[PDB]
Structure formats: C-alpha cells, structure tokens
Amino acid sequence: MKTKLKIGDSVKILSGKDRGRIGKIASINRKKNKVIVESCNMVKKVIKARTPQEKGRIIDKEAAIDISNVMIFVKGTSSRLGIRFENNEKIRYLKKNGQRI
Amino acid sequence: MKAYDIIVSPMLTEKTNTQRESINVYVFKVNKRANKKEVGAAIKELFNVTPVSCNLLNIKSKAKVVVSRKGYPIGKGKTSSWKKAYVYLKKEDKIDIF
Amino acid sequence: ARKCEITGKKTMFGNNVPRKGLAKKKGGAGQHIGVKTKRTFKVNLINKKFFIPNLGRSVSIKVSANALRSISKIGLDAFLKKNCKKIENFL
Amino acid sequence: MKNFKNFTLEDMKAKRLELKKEYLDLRFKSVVGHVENPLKKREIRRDIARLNTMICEYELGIRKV
RNA sequence: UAGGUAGUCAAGGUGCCAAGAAAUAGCUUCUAAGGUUAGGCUAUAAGGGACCGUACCGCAAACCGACACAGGUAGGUGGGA
RNA sequence: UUUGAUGGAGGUAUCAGAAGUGAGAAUGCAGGUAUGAGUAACGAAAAAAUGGGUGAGAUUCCCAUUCGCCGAAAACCUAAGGUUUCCUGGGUAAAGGUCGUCUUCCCAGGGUUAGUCGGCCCCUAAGGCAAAGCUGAAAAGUGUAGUCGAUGGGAAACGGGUU
RNA sequence: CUCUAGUCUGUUUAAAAAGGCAGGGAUGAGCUGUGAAUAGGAGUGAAAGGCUAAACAAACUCGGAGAUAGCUGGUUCUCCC
RNA sequence: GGAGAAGCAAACAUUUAUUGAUCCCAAGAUUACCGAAUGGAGUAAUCCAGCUAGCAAGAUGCUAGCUAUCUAUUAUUUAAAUAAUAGAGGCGAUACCAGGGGAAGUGAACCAUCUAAGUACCCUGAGGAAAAGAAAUCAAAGAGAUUCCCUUAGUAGUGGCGAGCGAAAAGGGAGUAGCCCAAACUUUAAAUGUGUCAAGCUGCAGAGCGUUGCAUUUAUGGGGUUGUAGGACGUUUAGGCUUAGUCUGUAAUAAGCAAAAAAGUUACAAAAUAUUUAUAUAGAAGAAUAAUCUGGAAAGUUUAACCAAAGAAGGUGAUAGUCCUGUAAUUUAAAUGUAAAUAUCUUUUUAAAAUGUUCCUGAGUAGGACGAGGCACGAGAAACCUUGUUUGAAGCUGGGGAGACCACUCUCCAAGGCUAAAUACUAGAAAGCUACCGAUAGAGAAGAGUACCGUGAGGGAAAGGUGAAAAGAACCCCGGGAGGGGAG
C-alpha cells in the first residue's frame, strides 16, 4: 500500500541475512508490500524457461525483501522519513536531521 | 448495427481452406444478432462485392467441467456460443484480405 | 361482495354458541356453554331499482334494508352525498 | 489513450470510421495468425469507446464546441 | 418376357347400426363503407426467401430404471428356402 | 513433577471469579480402520482360434484367414429423450467388475450450411386464460365477446456425387 | 401386440416384483402413441380398504414443533460419614 | 493521489503511464434481452405486429419513437367513447405496525366448557416508524391528550369457582404541542326546482316592482370551533379613506389600501438562494533506538536512552510505544445527499372587551329488543365499548358517564377530520466492544445453497495449515511412467 520510498533510492537493510548492506531499490511490489534491493537477498534459482529440450540452467537473482526491512540511507545517515510542504511541493526529509533528500 | 459489428473475423481451418480453394466459399464468424440480409450487405460494403447467397449456423456452447484447486468436479462451465456464416461469391469474385 | 354499495356494510363473522340449562333469572341453577362453532351473519342486500326523474330513468343498486330505510328517511341524493358517493358511479 | 481532446465533431466522425477499419483489419490479421501487438486490439477498442462518448456529448450538448 | 405380393386406385363398390371432428385457415365465390391503375387477371423477363432445429446415440455401455443393469422405448422398411 | 528423544512457538505459580468444566455403553452422531477374507461374486449355457503388426509391457488394441451368433434382428432409417458423448491427434491419476497401447474416460482442435425436411406462420379439437355481466371476509370463483392451445387440417424437389 | 393361471429358478437377486418353461384374450367391455381434465377428509374406483410419483383405513413438502409420553434407553472425576 | 497498472492470482508475452495512469469519491453517458413487463401473444431471456421517420424500401429486411390496466381530477349528456394530466402495479426486511380470517399437537393427569391463543399461518394495506391521540376521560382523587418503562400486583375480580386466567386508577419517570372543519349567518355564480306581487336593502325620503324572487345541490371568499361557546341583535368603538349597506346624495356598517406576526412536523402551499469550517459520501499531516550476545532470521537477552492528547490493534524471518501500516489530538469538498439558522418568499390579523333576545352546535345517530364479539370479568344482579337483524329520541328549559337499576348530587359535550417527540424493528452501511467460536467448533456455507437427491414444492453436504522467502529439486543414476537413490 501507501509508502514513502521511491524507486532508485539508496537504502540500508535493517534485518535479514544482509545486515547493513546498502543498495539501490530496483523494484517495488506493492501488492505484496515487498521491495527488491539490487545485489541483496541474493538467491540461486533454476530455470528451464520452456519445455523444449535445448538446456536449462542455474542463475542468480535477488528476492523481494519486505518493505519494513529497509530504511532510506543518504549521505552517511539512515533515518525515518517525514514530509513537508514548501514551494507547493510535497517534499521528503529525514526525521533525524531534516534535509532535502 | 453498422456493417462492422456484423462481421467479426474469418475462419482459417482445413475444411474452410479446401472449400475456398474448390468452390469459392468464404466462412466468417459473425455476430449472433445478424441475419442473412445484413450479412450480405456487410460483405458488400466491406469488400465491394455482392454475394450470391449466405448460409448461417448457430454453434452451441461447448461445456467443460470445472475442478477445484486440488482438482475434482465442482460444476459445469461453458464456452461462448457463436454464429458461423458461409458466403458464396460468383466464380470471378474474390476477397483479397485472406 | 355481500357489500352495501352505499354504506359499506359487509358480513360479520362470529360464533355459534349453544347453551344448556336454565338461567338464574328463571330459577335455574345456571347455564353452560357448549361447543362453539364458527358462523357468519349476512347483510340482506336488496337489488333495488330507484327511478330517478332527474334523468328520467331507473338505477339499480345493491343496498341493505338499513340503507333503504335511511334513504326513505333522508332522500337518495343527500344520503349518497353523506356517504360521499355519486349517482353516476352506478349505471 | 490517444489524444483527440481538441477535435471537432465531423473530424471525430472520420476518426471513428477509420479506426473501425483499423480494428476490423487487426482482427483479420490476428486470425490469419501472427500479430505482434495483440493488446493493440484493446487499445483500439478503448479509442472507439472514447469517440462514442465524445460524439454523444456533442449531441447532448454537455461538451460544447 | 411370364408370375406376383404391400402399397395404391380406395375418403371406391356393396352391406350394417353403434349413425361416425372443428376451422374465422386453405381453395372457390358474394358484396358494404369504399375504389375506377385504385386494382385484380393472364402471361413475360429481372431478384426476394423469413427466424429456429440440423453433429452423434436412438431395442441401447449415449433414453427411462441410483449402474457399462438378463427390464421398458412410438412409427416406416421386414431379402431367400 | 523430574530427566531423555520428538516438536519449532507460545505457556504457567498463588489468590479470587465464571462454566458449553471431566464419557465406556443412549440398536448415539461423525471420521478412520479391523473382522468375516484374499472368502462370495466379476451380471445371463451366441464361442472362439492362429499368424502378423504396434508397443517398456498383448488371452483383451489393429489387420488378415477360419469358426460361431442374430437375421419381423441382436440389421437399416426417422421420433420421444440425452447434449458433444460426433471426427482427427495425443494420454493412462482415476472411472471400465481382469488386462489395456483400447474405450461412450480425460485433454486440445475441428465438425451441424435449407424458399421445398421438421418448426415458426395461417387454422381450429380436448383444454387453459379471459374486458363485460354475476357471485364471494380477502386471496378469488363462475363466465360471453376475444386469444392461445397438435397428437389434426394448410403453397412448393428429386436423383447422384463429394468430406 | 397385450395381460399372468400352473410350475421352477431367483430370494445379502441380473431385476426395490423380473427370468425360463408355458398359459389367457387376440374385429373388440380390444391394445397403444401424443396432449388435456378431476387433489388429501378430497380425487378416482367393472369395487381389492385398490390406486393418486417404488410408502395410502386419509399422499408429499414446509411451518405450529424442541408436539405430547404414567413407557423404554442414556446421564461423564475422587474420597470421607 | 502520486507511480506503477492490465479484477478476484500468478504464470508468458505484448502494450499502456510523469502529456499524471491504475485506484478512490461525486455527477453524467452507454445501458443487449427477460422480468410488475404494460402493442398482441407466449414454452421468461422469443415470435407476431400496426402508425411515424431514416436506411437504394421491396418483396414476412434493419434501426429508432408511441399503442396495457386501475383510481382520482376535467373537455364533454363524469354513464358509452376517447382526450388531458396526476398517482398507483412489483420487490425488499424468513423484522417491526394496522385491519380481515383464524387453528391444532397440549394442559385440565379422560374430556366437551376452559386452556394453548388471538399464538402459528394466510390475506389486504401502509410507514420510517405504524397504530393511538387533545375527554360526551378517569375515578371518589382532584387531577387534565396519546404512547413507552417502574409500581400498584400476582392484588381486585374471574374460573366444569376445576386447571388456570388476571386488571386499571392512584403514585414515581422518559418525552412534551396542540389544532383544523361541518353548522349558525353571509359573499360570487352556475345548474336544477319554483314565482307574478311588495321579492329584495342599515334605518328618512325619490327611484323599486322581480338588484332571480326564494329555495336545493355544486363550486368559490369571509365568518367562526366550545365545562354553551359561537352568530344576528346593544353601544363605546369602529386607523383613515375609496367603493356600497337593491339606485343618487345625508346620520349608519361592510369589500379593498397603511400598521404586525406565524409558517412547510399538525396548525395553507410551492420553491429558490446565498449563507454554516455543520455533517455524510474520497483524502492530508501525524511524535520518538542504538549497541551487544545467542541464533537461519531479533522485535528477544544485556547495557543505556527517547516519544507519549499517540503503551488501541495488525504486519514485519522468534515476543516492537520509537521498522511499516496505523492509533491520540487535529483537519480536505469543486460535485452531490441531509440538516439547521438567516433573510427572499408565502399566508394571516387589517380590532378588542363589552347584555339579553330569536338561530345554530354533527340523526336512522344516542338509546331499546334479539343474536354474537372485545373488556382480566365464561350471563352472572352485568355496567362500558364495537356490531349483524330490527326499532327509534331529545335539540340546552338538552344530552353522556359515575360496573344492574332509580333519585339527588358531581363531572364531561358524542354521532367531523388532523398531529412531531418519548416507543417497536435492523435485512442491512460505517466505527467499535467481547471471562464469544478457532475448522466434528463458529452462519448451512473460511471454498456453498455449490456437489448430490426429488416430477415438483423442497431437502442439502464434505474438503483450512510447505517455508521467513519457491529459493518448486540444474544435473547424474534405476525405471515406460509413477516412485526412489545422489547432487543442489
């Protein structure tokens, strides 16, 4: 559902296998409330991709992490996000310090 | 109903292909609300040729049995019924779009 | 129905009550009610003809003897007016 | 969703006719067997519906030229 | 060629009493209000055929009997000795 | 209530309170599984046999040659009914009283073309409905003019070929 | 084509009334197809207390209804007097 | 509202979206055919048309728009017939309400009176509530409409005086509201009856012999509405005038105009506004944790904080006030619905108290007799109320009631019509609560009135859980597969 994170941001992973590893948000599945972080939660998968019999193979790809497990991380700081109204623009700022994202 | 809501799409089947090759007959899926006269008029307007005659059929809906997520019959579903048209042209006439 | 076309009287449903014994006001020890059954009291409609000189013709109405008595007492036009009906609704 | 939000009534009528051409031809090619963009059918159908409302609004006078 | 059945002629013919559908349809015919190319009729060439059903089983494992059931299911064909 | 093994996320001491509070039986209810027992049966005393082929697999499927059965049928064509069961290709969880490559079973696609056939329609029988009229606490009941209602009466085609 | 005397099989049956031998009627009070009509205290009945959707000395469904039983059955942990 | 979207679910492709999509709210457009189904018919989703217009119109062609019935009101000699409008038809709510019809299983240890019970059910009507309602009332107290709770009270009575049935007043609360006609006279007429002299008009007079003379019904404006008050008479009055109180001008009152108030909740009716940061149907913002240890995973252990009008509740890889969605306290409305208040507007008063005279004040009604019903009250001395069959009054110097009846006394004014709130109900929509259920439980149904059964009405199941994430077992081996043995 509604969330304050934008595709392309840089986030720090709060919990899971990848403590504190920092990656960019590649995609957001808001039907399941999950997020895909580039080069994080990285799983091995098998694909035949089709029934005809040339070959199948093992590839590596990221799995969707829950939204709650990431947090925006900008200029060496990670914090919650509030939003402000100035210049007729719903902008976003860091609750810890309060800067332009 | 304009002549575009009448003709739905042609049919490319082995039977229709041989019939078209041999006796110059074209088969269409048409709307269920059409009849002989406006099917002929629609053919004329669309392809600029007047058909000698037209024959229409009502194809009944094919029933299927629906099974659960596990899989076992829980009801009877059905396809959509439709109407098929055989169109007869003069031996010199042709339709090119096919 | 068995309905006075003027007043609206209709049949009235009630009981049928047999009684055995002798009433105390006749020296008897009393009366006892027997088996009550269902019954109906019927209006006595009359298919009467009233000749109206006002249009020189007779109109036939279903009225009860009570309504006939009242018409004889007050006059047909006034009675119809009182029961808010008009002669042209008949015919 | 294509942009006709400035067209006049008869221009919209002409657009509707040639779009119905497009839809019929698209159905025919789909049955003949290979059409690269099947969803073009849905797009064209929605366009035609848009035209029908917009014309209707012209006769009804809700949208004035 | 000759023989010849079940149909058909036949809603026939001949007897009998138990005295043997209806129709405003079809066919033919008569006229009122009206019409006098307004038509109706005889032809003649030109084209108009509505809408629905049409697969398959139908003495049976596909209909009716809870069944792939020793049962039931109208009618027309019923070869030869 | 202590300790092992299993389990992988919620429980419990004291006091007080409230009950849908304790099951072995009601020819109890529901589910699972024994027993009889690998026993009775496998649905009519018309009947099968060999070879070849297909296939992982054949008494059962396909083909060939014999034999047997029905033949006022157990043959052929239309109803009443069923509703894809029809044809082609593919498949064997299950269903087929065995087997199965097979099937009326399953999956996908294809297949029903009418001026003359049967309807629709114009007609009425049995009968239904029914303005008016009449009768009834109400719902409604009778009932004429009208309208529906085939198992009947009404314009029109036959032969051959083709998938 | 319609019915079932006699007898046998069947009788946890092939069949919730059939099957094998057979038997009665078979130009008529005959058999049968397709519709329609008569409904529960009512219908119908060449008359058996028969039949009215496999159940009829008063059908079926829902409701009163958790009807009523002096009748039958069942009623769950422990200890002390 | 802001970045994904193509429903409930992804798959696998192919497009849409920052030129603001999907989605949410409001309005509008489209809206096949059936169904009250209503042009006629019919086997509901389909045939048959007529009239007008458009398709080359046309041969059983197509698309549009009308043609059903009933009630009320008028255009008529409301009937016959159309015409004109207005309102109804059916469904929902296996609830509530009013009216009509009305059981039985049972209890009385039988059973018939009685009970169950005016319950079940059926039928006709409506509403947001319905019904009732402003005393011809209660009842021996001096109260003051109706309705719903508390008590009187299981009392008074009633009952094969058996089983059983069973008040109301008083007194204590919730909620509060009272009004409009008929008639009396009189005004504009129409129609129907009837008429040729004083038939009308405040009284002096001239006019005047029919201002239709007067009645009856209809319509219309005034007038008025009750423990006998109200009309006409009696003066003070009568705003002031203009018209006329049969005609003209004078003493003498009415029809219109200044001067005020109430109203769609009854009390006349119909709206339109703006106006209200009122509210309902989308939204906006929304506080304050780091490290460490175990562990696959932390929210947990441990050590320290920080927020709190927010420690309600869910989700997040184990148990989160500070991770997310939210919560507290605030707040968004172009459009639409509903509410108030304001004026617009509408209607009304264009006055009141003052004394007796004739008139009016609800008629087949009150009441009586007979047969029944409702009162707790089963005929009992049986009042009261409703009523079928009959009979039948008084007219304020009157009439009703006060549990047979009569007298005196006391209270009230019927035979006309309206009225919100307190009350009853929730199929449902929104927000919540739980010593309520956790898959044989809870709705029948976590997947359903489906499968299945019956000709039909109708009857009616069963089946939830991989993991934190498919990361759904690449590949190899046995096997026709299935299944298994390795590897991941």
From Swiss-Prot, chain A:
Origin superkingdom: Bacteria
GO molecular function terms listed in the Swiss-Prot or TrEMBL record: rRNA binding; structural constituent of ribosome
CDD domains linked: KOW_RPL26 (cd06089)
Cellular component per GO, a single term: ribonucleoprotein complex
Signal sequence region: none
SS bond list: none
Keyword Transmembrane: no
GO terms for biological process, alphabetical: translation
Record-stated family: Belongs to the universal ribosomal protein uL24 family.
Subunit structure: Part of the 50S ribosomal subunit.
Its biological purpose: One of two assembly initiator proteins, it binds directly to the 5'-end of the 23S rRNA, where it nucleates assembly of the 50S subunit. One of the proteins that surrounds the polypeptide exit tunnel on the outside of the subunit.
Name of the protein described by the UniProt record: Large ribosomal subunit protein uL24
Organism: Borreliella burgdorferi (strain ATCC 35210 / DSM 4680 / CIP 102532 / B31) (Borrelia burgdorferi)
Gene that produces this protein: rplX
Curated annotation (Swiss-Prot), chain B:
One example GO MF annotation: structural constituent of ribosome
GO cellular component entries: ribonucleoprotein complex; ribosome
Statement: the UniProt record of this protein carries the keyword Nucleotide-binding: no
Cross-referenced Pfam families: Ribosomal_L23
Any one GO biological process: translation
UniProt keyword annotation of Transferase present: no
InterPro entries given in the database record: Nucleotide-bd_a/b_plait_sf (IPR012677), Ribosomal_uL23-like (IPR013025), Ribosomal_uL23/eL15/eS24_sf (IPR012678)
Intrachain disulfide bonds: none
Keyword tags: Ribonucleoprotein, Ribosomal protein, RNA-binding, rRNA-binding
Subunit structure: Part of the 50S ribosomal subunit. Contacts protein L29, and trigger factor when it is bound to the ribosome.
Annotated function: One of the early assembly proteins it binds 23S rRNA. One of the proteins that surrounds the polypeptide exit tunnel on the outside of the ribosome. Forms the main docking site for trigger factor binding to the ribosome.
Family: Belongs to the universal ribosomal protein uL23 family.
Protein name as annotated: Large ribosomal subunit protein uL23
Protein's organism: Borreliella burgdorferi (strain ATCC 35210 / DSM 4680 / CIP 102532 / B31) (Borrelia burgdorferi)
UniProtKB/Swiss-Prot annotation, chain C:
SUPFAM superfamilies on file: L28p-like (SSF143800)
MF GO annotations: structural constituent of ribosome
GO CC annotation: ribonucleoprotein complex; ribosome
Record has Ribosomal protein as a keyword: yes
Keywords: Ribonucleoprotein, Ribosomal protein
GO biological process: translation
NCBIfam families in the cross-refs: L28 (TIGR00009)
Family label: Belongs to the bacterial ribosomal protein bL28 family.
Stored PANTHER family: 39S RIBOSOMAL PROTEIN L28, MITOCHONDRIAL, LARGE RIBOSOMAL SUBUNIT PROTEIN BL28M
Protein name (record): Large ribosomal subunit protein bL28
The species this protein was found in: Borreliella burgdorferi (strain ATCC 35210 / DSM 4680 / CIP 102532 / B31)
Name of the coding gene: rpmB
Curated annotation (Swiss-Prot), chain D:
Biological processes annotated in GO: translation
HAMAP family to which the protein is assigned, alphabetical: Ribosomal_uL29 (MF_00374)
Keywords on record: Ribonucleoprotein, Ribosomal protein
Organism for this UniProt entry: Borreliella burgdorferi (strain ATCC 35210 / DSM 4680 / CIP 102532 / B31) (Borrelia burgdorferi)
Keyword hit for Iron: no
Record NCBIfam families: L29
Keyword Ribosomal protein applies: yes
CDD domains per record: Ribosomal_L29_HIP (cd00427)
InterPro entries the UniProt entry points to: Ribosomal_uL29, Ribosomal_uL29_sf
Record GO terms (molecular function): structural constituent of ribosome
Identification of the protein by name: Large ribosomal subunit protein uL29
Family of the protein in this entry: Belongs to the universal ribosomal protein uL29 family.
Family matches, as Pfam families: Ribosomal_L29
A single cellular component GO annotation: ribonucleoprotein complex
Taxonomy, superkingdom: Bacteria
Span of the signal peptide: none
Name of the gene encoding the protein in the UniProt record: rpmC
